[PDB]
Design a binder for these strands. Structure first.
Ligand SMILES: [Mg+2]
Ligand SMILES: [Mg+2]
Ligand SMILES: [Mg+2]
Ligand SMILES: [Mg+2]
Ligand SMILES: [Mg+2]
Ligand SMILES: [Mg+2]
Ligand SMILES: [Mg+2]
Ligand SMILES: [Mg+2]
Ligand SMILES: [Mg+2]
Ligand SMILES: [Mg+2]
Ligand SMILES: [Mg+2]
Ligand SMILES: [Mg+2]
Ligand SMILES: [Mg+2]
Ligand SMILES: [Mg+2]
Ligand SMILES: [Mg+2]
Ligand SMILES: [Mg+2]
Ligand SMILES: [Mg+2]
Ligand SMILES: [Mg+2]
Ligand SMILES: [Mg+2]
Ligand SMILES: [Mg+2]
Ligand SMILES: [Mg+2]
Ligand SMILES: [Mg+2]
Ligand SMILES: [Mg+2]
Ligand SMILES: [Mg+2]
Ligand SMILES: [Mg+2]
Ligand SMILES: [Mg+2]
Ligand SMILES: [Mg+2]
Ligand SMILES: [Mg+2]
Ligand SMILES: [Mg+2]
Ligand SMILES: [Mg+2]
Ligand SMILES: [Mg+2]
Ligand SMILES: [Mg+2]
Ligand SMILES: [Mg+2]
Ligand SMILES: [Mg+2]
Ligand SMILES: [Mg+2]
Ligand SMILES: [Mg+2]
Ligand SMILES: [Mg+2]
Ligand SMILES: [Mg+2]
Ligand SMILES: [Mg+2]
Ligand SMILES: [Mg+2]
Ligand SMILES: [Mg+2]
Ligand SMILES: [Mg+2]
Ligand SMILES: [Mg+2]
Ligand SMILES: [Mg+2]
Ligand SMILES: [Mg+2]
Lengths: 61, 128, 87, 200
RNA sequence: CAUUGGAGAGUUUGAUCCUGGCUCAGGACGAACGCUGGCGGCGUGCUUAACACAUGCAAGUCGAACGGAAAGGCCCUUGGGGUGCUCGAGUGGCGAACGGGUGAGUAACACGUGAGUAACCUGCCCUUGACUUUGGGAUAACUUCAGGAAACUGGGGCUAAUACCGGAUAGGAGCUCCUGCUGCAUGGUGGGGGUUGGAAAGUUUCGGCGGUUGGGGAUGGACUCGCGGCUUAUCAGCUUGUUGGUGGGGUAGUGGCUUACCAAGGCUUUGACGGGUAGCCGGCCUGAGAGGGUGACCGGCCACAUUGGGACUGAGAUACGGCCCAGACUCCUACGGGAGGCAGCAGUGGGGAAUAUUGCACAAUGGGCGGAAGCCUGAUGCAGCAACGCCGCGUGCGGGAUGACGGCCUUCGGGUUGUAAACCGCUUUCGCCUGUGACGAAGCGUGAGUGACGGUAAUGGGUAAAGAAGCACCGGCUAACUACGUGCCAGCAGCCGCGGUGAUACGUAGGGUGCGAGCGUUGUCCGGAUUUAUUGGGCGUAAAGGGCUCGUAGGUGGUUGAUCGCGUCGGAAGUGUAAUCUUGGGGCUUAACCCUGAGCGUGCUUUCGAUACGGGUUGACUUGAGGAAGGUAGGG
RNA sequence: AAACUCAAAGGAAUUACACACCGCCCGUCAAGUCAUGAAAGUUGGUAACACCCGAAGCCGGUGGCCUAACCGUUGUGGGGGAGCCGUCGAAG
């Protein structure tokens, strides 16, 4: 299936192990799943400071 | 064989037993032919309620008590009515008695030394 | 087997099987003897065979090789056949 | 599991004095923050939620326990708001506050959780202990000379004790005549609005 | 002769109303993930691979049945006394069919509920009536020999019993004949007679403990039956031991259960047969209710134990830790042949988004054996692990304007963070340190003694305001707004939509809001959805009247007499275990949780009433309907 | 029917259009993407059927071989057992 990759920033590439959750992207026909940031190979969005948990960004001291 | 035994109930570290009648093959906490009494040992002078008529009927029909139930029947006097033996038959002592309304009426009126030890604690803050 | 109780049990089960099989085969032989006497139509031979077979059925029921109800059923069949032969 | 932040901010947001008087609530007509003076729409949810939050921050009760109180009141027979306010008043910290041995409900919670109190002979350090009728709350004998206790003993005469409690101030003894009625709880929220809120 | 209970919002248009779908606010979970994480109480924890399993343990016990003496133990010049307790191995008894696990199979009398067995069996236990008589032959152990790598196997000799086998004696066991009272057809039962028969065991420390057989009781099981709960007609025919009959056989027992013979049945559009899925239920979640979803823990029933089949032993067997055969696997082998089955507990690999310790104790309760002391118990009681759920508590409390700095905003006035801080005075729950220290045991043990949990809970003292706050959101629904950056880019979104240079919608910051040891996201279910409408909808034009009629099953029925009492209604009895749930009391410091009384258990069976209505039976009436006679219109 | 796709489609009415006739709107063809049908064939799976063979086992026979208890006319017989055959029978 096709999965959206949310957040500004992206590292995952060919043969990268990912966790895929539900979630529709309305302005994208045929995309019904999203990739969970911060799990398996995909990593959290770099410069997050708000809604960090939804993008897998660890809290910064 | 049909047994008169204890069925465990309650919380962890807080057992309450049901003196029940079931056959040996049945699991401990399972369906019982009849519930005869209850036994709360966690409480002070353990509570021991045994239905005398039913326990006499089951003893006379041939149910075999477990040692615990034998102790309870000794305390309730049923183990003497059936299989007559010289035993003290120490019918349960009551687990004492508190009250609330009498204490409230006693203190509402207590007044005196209530506010009196009260101005004594006034002198205490002075001492404080 | 993995339990020494169970090894003891398989040994005793074999022993009891030998005993029970012998008794049941004897019962079958006696009943067959009575049936062949009845088919031959003799009266004295059928009577003697019926007595023997009924006694042995009761003996086996007492020994526990067969149930008392099974012994009673087979005895009833034998006695009814003998009565029909006499009539 | 306990609100430790400022209470004047909550009182200003809710528009009413949650506790006390003659304080920074001279800035009352507007909630805290940069956007305080603007005109408000105030939907029905807004209104209801305001009443519920007023009760919650007045009594120092969080949402799960307040909800539990709501189902208990709803199950109970009689007016749901009356029963809910009765429960919240039957809380032990509120009992100490109403009897006047504490300056505020937060101070009452402090002393109760620290165990300076006896309930009819038995020590209780649970602020949410629901006091029953004909109960006798007593100050712990070791802690009969606390500074907050002596301040309350100096000030209680000004404070008004409700009809459902009898207090032996100097003795530290709160006799519960009966569990209070709606006419006895001071009217400062809309329990009917709270009940309507918990139905959407 | 009143109720405890029902909320919407956005979106079709230029605008409107209706219809209508979509989306959202709620609740929930055996959940997972992200960020974060202090404690305690009570629960819960492989939902996927019924996938393959290393290792330990999970079923033994009895010397008061027996020969005995391989250990320990007493008495003796090292062996010797089996001598006493004790005691491996062996016979013998009982248990091993329970407890524990799993949900693969099963759409079926499997389960729920209620009945029937005049078609049933039931060890141990209770009760009652008779008895416990007389003989005999072996054998394991041991000993010797042979074979085998092993597993072990086969001879010779020898030995005891409550092991095994003759006999006698015993009804309510077979057959048969009278006779009393009777049922529901087969029949049940009381009494008498004839005839043929069926048992047993001894042992002891003399306190015991046992044996056989009738009859009842209790307990447990078995079968049969009425009713009830999935989907599919793009499955229409199914069946030949199939349906019934008679004789025999078999079984605890009825029965095509089996067999021979005879007959041609049996089931099905009210859905047989076939396909799909599934263990069922008490319950759980949701809901105003009616319903809808579900079958984790706990409890009841069923099924299964490597796959398939089979019997044996037994009172009792899907025989989990039994046996036999076959298949697939793993292991040992000297190549001849052997051994094994974690869906027991813990654990490993594997699969997976995902689920724990190779723990302690038999102290308590329950179970097995023993006369008993006692032994066994991965049942159970506990502890470990995980915010997985629920509940409770803490991270401070009072005072403090001079409204301080600093951030952020600004109209450069100030505003805001904010009594917030600073500062002052207090308190010590939890954590940390230290002391005291249980209940559970009215148990057990002849006594002495005896708590796994456990120095645990609880509690005294001490420390410092300290060791203890995060997460989501802020355009509308929806509680909460501004600045800066970006410029249809980066991105956001559940829907409407936002971003094209003034973005309250992206990113950050200040401020705020909702929650809080949690907070969000995802998945799934119910709600909202009256959006399958029985409660509770509709079909002229919005989706929806068959093209039309005839007519089969079915549904439905004008007035009235009589009667039945099936529906319906009202009592009574039985049942609906417990837990859950509602509610009254009580206990845990409160709560969660736990105990206890009641209700509920919405039904079913039995029985007694009522007869208005529905229906059955039966009889009337003519108004509905049809017919006769006469009249009569018409591109039928 | 289903996959898939849209967040409308629609009814009546007001002033098939409302960006308002320089409106709206239909279908081939060309390009890309997604889901689906047909298809010589090809590759699996499940549930059975008819035959052949048929282990264990129970049952039914047979048993010349082996047999301590029973009976003997004490040369044995009775009864049993190994073995063997037959039906059924998993698997193949
Ligand atoms: Mg023979
Ligand atoms: Mg017969
Ligand atoms: Mg339109
Ligand atoms: Mg619009
Ligand atoms: Mg031994
Ligand atoms: Mg079971
Ligand atoms: Mg289950
Ligand atoms: Mg014997
Ligand atoms: Mg049915
Ligand atoms: Mg027949
Ligand atoms: Mg299944
Ligand atoms: Mg169901
Ligand atoms: Mg279960
Ligand atoms: Mg048997
Ligand atoms: Mg077994
Ligand atoms: Mg079992
Ligand atoms: Mg096993
Ligand atoms: Mg396991
Ligand atoms: Mg994995
Ligand atoms: Mg015990
Ligand atoms: Mg004992
Ligand atoms: Mg053991
Ligand atoms: Mg708002
Ligand atoms: Mg900007
Ligand atoms: Mg509905
Ligand atoms: Mg929905
Ligand atoms: Mg409609
Ligand atoms: Mg109509
Ligand atoms: Mg239409
Ligand atoms: Mg028409
Ligand atoms: Mg047609
Ligand atoms: Mg008709
Ligand atoms: Mg009518
Ligand atoms: Mg009438
Ligand atoms: Mg209850
Ligand atoms: Mg209480
Ligand atoms: Mg119940
Ligand atoms: Mg009628
Ligand atoms: Mg005419
Ligand atoms: Mg195709
Ligand atoms: Mg064959
Ligand atoms: Mg044979
Ligand atoms: Mg012979
Ligand atoms: Mg054969
Ligand atoms: Mg086959």
């Amino acid at each position: 299936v096709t999965a959206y990759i949310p957040g500004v920033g992206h590292n995952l590439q060919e043969h990268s192990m990912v966790l895929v959750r539900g979630g529709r992207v309305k302005d994208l026909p045929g995309v019904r799943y999203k990739i969970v940031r911060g799990s398996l190979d995909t990593q959290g969005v770099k410069g997050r400071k708000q809604a960090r948990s939804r993008y897998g960004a660890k809290k910064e001291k | 064989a049909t047994k008169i035994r204890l069925k465990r109930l309650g919380k962890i570290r807080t057992p309450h037993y049901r003196v029940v009648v079931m056959d040996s093959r049945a699991k401990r906490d399972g369906r019982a032919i009849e519930e005869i009494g209850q036994y709360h040992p966690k409480a002070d002078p353990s509570v021991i309620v045994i239905d005398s008529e039913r326990v006499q009927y089951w003893l006379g029909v041939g149910a075999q008590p477990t040692e615990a139930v034998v102790a309870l029947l000794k305390r309730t006097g049923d183990w003497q009515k059936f299989t007559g033996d010289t035993s003290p038959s120490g019918v349960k002592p009551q687990p004492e008695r508190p009250n609330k309304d009498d204490l409230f009426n006693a203190a509402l009126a207590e007044a005196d030394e209530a506010p009196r030890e009260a101005i004594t604690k006034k002198s205490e803050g002075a001492a404080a | 087997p993995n339990i020494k109780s169970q090894i003891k049990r398989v040994k005793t089960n074999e022993k009891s099987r030998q005993r029970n099989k012998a008794v049941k085969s004897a019962l079958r032989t006696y009943v067959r003897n009575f049936r062949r006497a009845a088919e031959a139509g003799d009266v004295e031979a059928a009577t003697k065979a019926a007595r023997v077979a009924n006694r042995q059925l009761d003996k086996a029921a007492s020994k526990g090789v067969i149930h008392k109800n099974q012994a009673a059923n087979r005895k009833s069949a034998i006695s009814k056949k003998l009565n029909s032969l006499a009539a | 599991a306990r609100y430790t932040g400022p209470l004047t901010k909550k009182s200003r947001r809710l528009g009413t004095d949650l506790v006390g008087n003659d304080k920074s609530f001279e800035r009352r007509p507007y909630p805290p923050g940069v956007h305080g003076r603007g005109r408000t729409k105030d939907s029905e949810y807004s209104l209801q939620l305001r009443e519920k939050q007023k009760a919650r921050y007045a009594y120092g009760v969080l949402e799960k326990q307040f909800r539990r109180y709501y189902e208990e009141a709803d199950r109970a027979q009689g007016k749901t708001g009356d029963v809910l306010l009765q429960i919240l008043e039957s809380r032990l910290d509120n009992v100490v506050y109403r009897a006047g041995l504490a300056a505020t409900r937060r101070q009452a919670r402090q002393m109760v959780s620290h165990g300076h109190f006896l309930v009819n002979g038995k020590k209780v350090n649970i602020p949410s202990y629901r006091v029953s009728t004909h109960d006798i709350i007593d100050v712990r004998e070791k802690s009969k000379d606390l500074p907050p206790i002596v301040i309350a003993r100096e000030t209680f005469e000004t404070r008004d004790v409700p009809a459902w409690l009898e207090v032996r101030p100097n003795k530290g003894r709160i006799l519960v005549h009966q569990l209070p009625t709606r006419d006895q709880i001071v009217i400062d929220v809309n329990e009917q609005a709270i009940v309507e809120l918990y139905s959407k």
